[PDB]
Amino acid sequence: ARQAARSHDIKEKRLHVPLVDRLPDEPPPRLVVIVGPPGVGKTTLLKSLVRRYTKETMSDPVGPITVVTSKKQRLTFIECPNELEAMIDMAKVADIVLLMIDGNYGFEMETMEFLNILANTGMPGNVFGILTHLDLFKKPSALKDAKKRLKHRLWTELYQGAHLFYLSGVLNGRYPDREIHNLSRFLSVMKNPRPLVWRNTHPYTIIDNYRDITHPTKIEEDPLCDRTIELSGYLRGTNFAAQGQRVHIAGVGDFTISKIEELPDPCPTPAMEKAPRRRLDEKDKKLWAPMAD
Amino acid sequence: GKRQITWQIQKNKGLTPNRKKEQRNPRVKKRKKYEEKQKKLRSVKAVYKGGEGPGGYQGELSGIKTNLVKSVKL
Amino acid sequence: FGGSSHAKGIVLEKVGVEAKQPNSAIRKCVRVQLIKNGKKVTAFVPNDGCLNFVDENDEVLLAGFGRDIPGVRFKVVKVSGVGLLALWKEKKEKPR
Amino acid sequence: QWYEMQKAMLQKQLDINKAEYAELDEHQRRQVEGYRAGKYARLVIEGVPAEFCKNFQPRMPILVGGLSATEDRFGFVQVRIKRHRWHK
Amino acid sequence: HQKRLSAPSHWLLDKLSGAYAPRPSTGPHKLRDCMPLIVFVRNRLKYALNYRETKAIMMQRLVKVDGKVRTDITYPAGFMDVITIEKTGENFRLIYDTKGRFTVHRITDEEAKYKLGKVKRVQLGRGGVPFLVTHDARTIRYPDPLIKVNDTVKIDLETGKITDFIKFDTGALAMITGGRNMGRVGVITHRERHDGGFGIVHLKDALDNTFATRESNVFVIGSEKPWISLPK
Amino acid sequence: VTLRTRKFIRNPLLSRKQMVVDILHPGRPNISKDELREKLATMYKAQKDQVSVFGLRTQYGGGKTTGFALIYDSPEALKKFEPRYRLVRAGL
Amino acid sequence: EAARLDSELKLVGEYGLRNKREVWRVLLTLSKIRRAARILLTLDEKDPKRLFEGNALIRRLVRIGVLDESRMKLDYVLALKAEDFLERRLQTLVYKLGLAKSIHHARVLIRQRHIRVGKQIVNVPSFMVRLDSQKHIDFALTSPFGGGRPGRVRRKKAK
Amino acid sequence: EYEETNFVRLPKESKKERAKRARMEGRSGRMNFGGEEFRELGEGAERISRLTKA
RNA sequence: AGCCUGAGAAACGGCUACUACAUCCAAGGAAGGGCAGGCGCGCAAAUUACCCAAUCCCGACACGGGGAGGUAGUGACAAUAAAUACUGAUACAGGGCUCUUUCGGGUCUUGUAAUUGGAAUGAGUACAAUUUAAAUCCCUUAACGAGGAACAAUUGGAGG
Ligand SMILES: Nc1nc2c(ncn2[C@@H]2O[C@H](COP(=O)(O)OP(=O)(O)OP(=O)(O)O)[C@@H](O)[C@H]2O)c(=O)[nH]1
Numbered sequence A: 001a002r003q004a005a006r007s008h009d010i011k012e013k014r015l016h017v018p019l020v021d022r023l024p025d026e027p028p029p030r031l032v033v034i035v036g037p038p039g040v041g042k043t044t045l046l047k048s049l050v051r052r053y054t055k056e057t058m059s060d061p062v063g064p065i066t067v068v069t070s071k072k073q074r075l076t077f078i079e080c081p082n083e084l085e086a087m088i089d090m091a092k093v094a095d096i097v098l099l100m101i102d103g104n105y106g107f108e109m110e111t112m113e114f115l116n117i118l119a120n121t122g123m124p125g126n127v128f129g130i131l132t133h134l135d136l137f138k139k140p141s142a143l144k145d146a147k148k149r150l151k152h153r154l155w156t157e158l159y160q161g162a163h164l165f166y167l168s169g170v171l172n173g174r175y176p177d178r179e180i181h182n183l184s185r186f187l188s189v190m191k192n193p194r195p196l197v198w199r200n201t202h203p204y205t206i207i208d209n210y211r212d213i214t215h216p217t218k219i220e221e222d223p224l225c226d227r228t229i230e231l232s233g234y235l236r237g238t239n240f241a242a243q244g245q246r247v248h249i250a251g252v253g254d255f256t257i258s259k260i261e262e263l264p265d266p267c268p269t270p271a272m273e274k275a276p277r278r279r280l281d282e283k284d285k286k287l288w289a290p291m292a293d
Numbered sequence B: 001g002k003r004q005i006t007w008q009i010q011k012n013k014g015l016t017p018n019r020k021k022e023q024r025n026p027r028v029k030k031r032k033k034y035e036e037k038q039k040k041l042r043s044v045k046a047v048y049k050g051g052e053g054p055g056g057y058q059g060e061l062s063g064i065k066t067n068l069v070k071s072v073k074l
Numbered sequence C: 001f002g003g004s005s006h007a008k009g010i011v012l013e014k015v016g017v018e019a020k021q022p023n024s025a026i027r028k029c030v031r032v033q034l035i036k037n038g039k040k041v042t043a044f045v046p047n048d049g050c051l052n053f054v055d056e057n058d059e060v061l062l063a064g065f066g067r068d069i070p071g072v073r074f075k076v077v078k079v080s081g082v083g084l085l086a087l088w089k090e091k092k093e094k095p096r
Numbered sequence D: 001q002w003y004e005m006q007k008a009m010l011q012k013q014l015d016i017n018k019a020e021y022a023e024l025d026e027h028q029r030r031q032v033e034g035y036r037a038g039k040y041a042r043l044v045i046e047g048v049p050a051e052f053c054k055n056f057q058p059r060m061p062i063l064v065g066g067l068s069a070t071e072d073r074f075g076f077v078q079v080r081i082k083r084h085r086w087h088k
Numbered sequence E: 001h002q003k004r005l006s007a008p009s010h011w012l013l014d015k016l017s018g019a020y021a022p023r024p025s026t027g028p029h030k031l032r033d034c035m036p037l038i039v040f041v042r043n044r045l046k047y048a049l050n051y052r053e054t055k056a057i058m059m060q061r062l063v064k065v066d067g068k069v070r071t072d073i074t075y076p077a078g079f080m081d082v083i084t085i086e087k088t089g090e091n092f093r094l095i096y097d098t099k100g101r102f103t104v105h106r107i108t109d110e111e112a113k114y115k116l117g118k119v120k121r122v123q124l125g126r127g128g129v130p131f132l133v134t135h136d137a138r139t140i141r142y143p144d145p146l147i148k149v150n151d152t153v154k155i156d157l158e159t160g161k162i163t164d165f166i167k168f169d170t171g172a173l174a175m176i177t178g179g180r181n182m183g184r185v186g187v188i189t190h191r192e193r194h195d196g197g198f199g200i201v202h203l204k205d206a207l208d209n210t211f212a213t214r215e216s217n218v219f220v221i222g223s224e225k226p227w228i229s230l231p232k
Numbered sequence F: 001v002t003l004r005t006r007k008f009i010r011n012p013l014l015s016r017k018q019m020v021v022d023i024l025h026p027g028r029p030n031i032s033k034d035e036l037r038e039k040l041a042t043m044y045k046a047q048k049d050q051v052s053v054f055g056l057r058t059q060y061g062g063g064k065t066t067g068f069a070l071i072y073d074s075p076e077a078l079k080k081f082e083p084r085y086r087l088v089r090a091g092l
Numbered sequence G: 001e002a003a004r005l006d007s008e009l010k011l012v013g014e015y016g017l018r019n020k021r022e023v024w025r026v027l028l029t030l031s032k033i034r035r036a037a038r039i040l041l042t043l044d045e046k047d048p049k050r051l052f053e054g055n056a057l058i059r060r061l062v063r064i065g066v067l068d069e070s071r072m073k074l075d076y077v078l079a080l081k082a083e084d085f086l087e088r089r090l091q092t093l094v095y096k097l098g099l100a101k102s103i104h105h106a107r108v109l110i111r112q113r114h115i116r117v118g119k120q121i122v123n124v125p126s127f128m129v130r131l132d133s134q135k136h137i138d139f140a141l142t143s144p145f146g147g148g149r150p151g152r153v154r155r156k157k158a159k
Numbered sequence H: 001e002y003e004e005t006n007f008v009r010l011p012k013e014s015k016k017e018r019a020k021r022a023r024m025e026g027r028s029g030r031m032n033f034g035g036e037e038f039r040e041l042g043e044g045a046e047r048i049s050r051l052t053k054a
Numbered sequence I: 001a002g003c004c005u006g007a008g009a010a011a012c013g014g015c016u017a018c019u020a021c022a023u024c025c026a027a028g029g030a031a032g033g034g035c036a037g038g039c040g041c042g043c044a045a046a047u048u049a050c051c052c053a054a055u056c057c058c059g060a061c062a063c064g065g066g067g068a069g070g071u072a073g074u075g076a077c078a079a080u081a082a083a084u085a086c087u088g089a090u091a092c093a094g095g096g097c098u099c100u101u102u103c104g105g106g107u108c109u110u111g112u113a114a115u116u117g118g119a120a121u122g123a124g125u126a127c128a129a130u131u132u133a134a135a136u137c138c139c140u141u142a143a144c145g146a147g148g149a150a151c152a153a154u155u156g157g158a159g160g
C-alpha cells in the first residue's frame, strides 16, 4: 500500500502547467551567463571554459562566445559586466546561469540582486553556484565552515540541494583542469530549457558581431548623424517578421528592421552536417567568438 | 570597496513575530515559569517556610479570622 | 482526491476577487483545475493579503483543509514551488 | 492522463505548423513563416544615433528584442506592485 | 593473501597486524604446518617492526635457518628448524606446547648443532643406492640399514650425516603433531595395525590420560632421553 | 622537560636503540621533537643527527607525552635503515 | 494532561533541568530498571536466577548510589523513583555540596568548566555521579575559584 | 599494552570497525546508566539456572 | 567455427575466414569492437578528493610496479551530549495570586523599560608545537573573545 502511496506522490510531483515549448529542430546555442560581483574572476572562468572546450587560449575574451559541446547541442558564454543595466538586460535572456560567490568574503549584494532579479523576471532551468577564491584561506576548518554556510544560504536563496562547485586555485592564470572538467561535466549534458512565456512569445537575438555600415561621405558631412548598423546573431525566440519588424535594442531604444539576411551557421554542430557514436572528434570542437581574439 | 551583505539578507528573518528574551532560552523560561507557579501555590495552600523566626513569636502577623473552618470534614 | 496527499493544479480564476469584506471566505476561495484528473475544484488561500501571491495560470500544490463556506475541502499550500506561508512571511520570492 | 493529453495537443499543433509551411520556399518559408529561429542572421538597422557607435564598448552586450503590435502603444499601465523585502 | 582469521591458529597473530596475513612460500615444510620467517622475526620475537625492516634484516646475511642462510622473507620453517642469529648470538628452536601452538626455545651451539628429524620413507634411489627422506625433505644417501619408517634421526647439520636414531617403539615417549589431540607429549604404550589404511597408536601422558592418535600424526622424541630441551 | 625512558631494547641486528620515551611538559606547550632530538644526544651520549623520534602523542590534560625514540649507531646506519617519511621529518 | 504537565514542571523546577526531554530520558531508564525488578519478582524466592540477578541489580544500584544502603530489597528497587535519579545527577550534587549558590549557577559552572569529578574536568551537567565518586567534586586547578590565573574580567580590570 | 611492544602507532579505530561495534548496541539490550553495566534479563539469566542444576 | 603460448587457459590475451556495426582517406587503401558518470518531466538533493605510509602481492630483483587497503570531505534520515547567561545591593510602588458557589469568598510579600555593582566565560578569532605518506580531526596551547541597539531561537495555537 505504501508503494502505491509513494507512487501517487511522485506521480503528483511530475506534473506542471501545460505550456508551449517553441523550440526548433535545429536549436540555437543555449546562453550561459557568468554573473558575479566585481573582482571575482568571471573573465578567468570564461578563459578556462573556452580552453577546456575549444583549446584556444584567449588573451581577452569579450562578447558572446559560441562553442560546440555535443553533436546535438552547443553553448554560448556571455560574461555579464558589473553594471546593473547589463544584469537586468541579461536576466531575461539567460538559459543557464553560472553564479559566482567570492569564497572567504562571503555573499555580495550583486549576487543577491541578480538572484532575485532572475527569480522575478523568469526562472531558467539550471543555475549553478560557483564558489571561488578558496585558496585565500589559512585554516581548512574555516574553509569547510565557509563552504557549509555559503551552501546553506544559497540553498535558502534559490532552492534546496543545488549544485555548488568549489574552484580552488589559479595555477597558470587560468583554473585547475579537473575542477573545470567536472563543472563542464555538469553543464555539458543538458535538458530542454524551461518553457518561459516571454521567450516563447517574443523573438529575441543576442548580437554576436557588430559593424557600422555607413558611408564616409555621410560621416564627413555630419559627424553625428543617423548611422546604419549590421548586427549578426542567432535568432532565438520565435521567428522574426519577414518585413517591418519592430526592434528594441536594449540600452539604445526602438527601431525597425531594414534588412534580414538569413545565412548558414559558423558553428555547424555535426547533426546539422550529417543532416550513433558518443565521442566528439576534434574536427567538431569549433569556436565562434567574432568579437574576441 | 565591496558591498557587504547585511544581517537582514544574511539570515532570512522575514516577518517572524517579536518574541521574548525569556523565550530565546528554554531553561531560563522554565526557571521563571517555576518561580511564578511556586508563587501561585502560596496563594492557594499554605507552605511551611520556616517555623518561628529567630526573633520569636511576633503574633500571627497577617490577621486571625474566627469564623473560618479550614478542616477537611471526613 | 486520487491516491495522493497533495494534488497540483492550475489557478483558473480567483473567484470572489470583487467581494467587499476583506477576510470573507468567498474572498479567500480560488477555483483551480487539478492536473492529474482534470476537474475544477475550489481551494482556500489561507489569508486575504496572501491572495495577492496567487496569480492566474500558476502551478499550485494543494492539500486538505482539516478543521463561511463549509465544504470547500482544499487549501493552497505551495505556489510555483515556493511555500505560500513563506511567500506571506516574505522569506522567498516567487519564481515566475 | 490530462497532463500528457494537453502536452500532446500542444505537440500536435507544433507538428501542424512545420507540416503546413513545409510546402514552398519563396512564399511560405520566406514570407509566411518569417525568419525561423536558430538560424544565424544578419540584421541591418537604419537610423541609429552616432553616440552609440562612439561609445560602443564590446563588454556591455547588445540584446535585440521584438516588440509586439501591443508593445509600441502608450497608455496607463495598471500594475500590482510591492516593495522588496530587503529594500530599506 | 589470506585474512588474519583464515591464517591457522598455531602461529599466533593479535589484533595488530592488519586484516591480512602473509602466506608461506613453497618449501620443505607444509602450508598449514608452518611458521614463516617474517612471523618468526616480527610477529613472535619482535626483533623487527615492519615488512621493510624484516627485509633489511633478511637481505643481509644475518639470519641462518637450519645452518644455511635463508634470504627470502616468507621462507617456511615449520618444525624443529634451528634458527641461528649471530649478531644476537642466539639459536631458537621450534617445538609445540600442550594447547597446540608454536613455541620458541632459546639455546646455544651445543644443542643447536643437531636436528631430530622423523623419517618419511626409505627407498632404493638411482645408482642402486638406498636413500632416506625425512619430514624436512632431507634425503640422506647411504643411511644406516635399520632406520626404517617412523624412526627419528639426529642429523649433523654441519655435514648433514646420520649420528643416531630412535626406533618406533611401544614404550618410547612421543610428541603429537596433528589431529584433535595435537601437541601432547606422552609415551607410546600401544600400537594397532589396522591394515587397509589409517592405523593408530594408543598413547598416554605422564599422568594417565589414554588417547588414540594416528601413526602419521605421531612424532618420536625419545624414550626418556630428551635430546632436545623441551622448556622447563 | 622531565624525561623518563621505559622499555629500552638493544636491537643489534637492526643496530638501533629502541626507547619508549615518556616526556613531560607541565605548564609548557608541546615538546618540538627536533628539540627533543637535540635533547636525546647527551642523555644517551650520542650525536643529534643519529636520533629519530616518532609516535609522540600527548596525554590528556597536559604534562605527559609518550614518544618512541630510536638512536642509531651511525648517521649512515640511520640513512640506510630509516623510512623515507621519517627521514624527511627529521631533515636528512 | 495537566497532571503530567505539573509533574514534569515540578521536576524541571526542583532540579534545574532544561526541557522535558531530560525528564523523559530519566523516566525511560527508570522504567527499564523497574521492569527488570518486576520480572525478577515474577519468579519465586530461592530461584538461582532471581537470587544472583537480583543481587547483581541491587549491588549495581547501591554502587551507583541511587538505592540507599539501608534498604536492599527488590520491592524497594520497585519503589525507586525519578527524584532519586535526578538527585544523583551531577548538577544537583554541585548545588547540594555548595560550590554553587543555585542549581542554575551549578549548571553554569559545569558548562564553563570549573568543577572536576576526581581528576578530569566534567563538561556535562547530567553526569551520573556514583557514591564512591561523590566526595571528589571540587573546583579544578585551572579555574579562578581553584587557582592559577585570576581570570578574564579580572584581567581586563587589572590592566 | 600493544603500543609499547614494537611501538608502532595505531589508527584510532576506522569506518569499518565503528560500523561494527556501534551496530552491536543496536542488537543488544545492554545499557550503561553509570559506571556499571545493566544487562538484560534474557538468556543471560537462564545460564544461572543452567549451571546450578549440573 | 577453427587455431597459437605456457607447468597450469579451450586465456578471449591474440590471429584466420564468414556475419553484423563503425572510423580516417588524397577514393587506390588502412586500423577497431570495455566499464564508470549525468539526463532519463520543464523542477534538482552523498566527492569527478589524497596516497601505497601500514597489512598483502609480482618481478633479473633490498630500490621497480599494484583499482585490495587505509586517509579525508558531505549529512536534521536517524541517534548522542547541551550553549543563548550566573549572582548581589539600593531606590520606588502596593498590590500580586486564586476559586465551588462570583456584584461573593480565600491567601500574604510581590513587581519595575528603576539606579548601580560583581565576577564566570565558550562559540569564534588564533601564534605555535604535535598528529599524519602530506594534510585534517583529536589531545596539548601563548594571546584576544559579552551588555541587548547584541556573538541577534525557532515552530505552532488561543486572546485582548
Ligand atoms: N587566489 C585566487 N585568485 C583568484 C581566483 N579567481 C580569480 N582570482 C584572481 O583575481 C583576479 C580577478 O580577475 P578576473 O577574474 O578577470 O576578475 P573578473 O571580475 O572576472 O573580471 P572583471 O569583472 O573585469 O573584474 C585575477 O587576477 C585572478 O588571478 C581564485 O579562485 N583564487
Ligand SMILES: [Mg+2]
Pocket: A042, A043, A079, A080, A081
Ligand atoms: Mg568579464
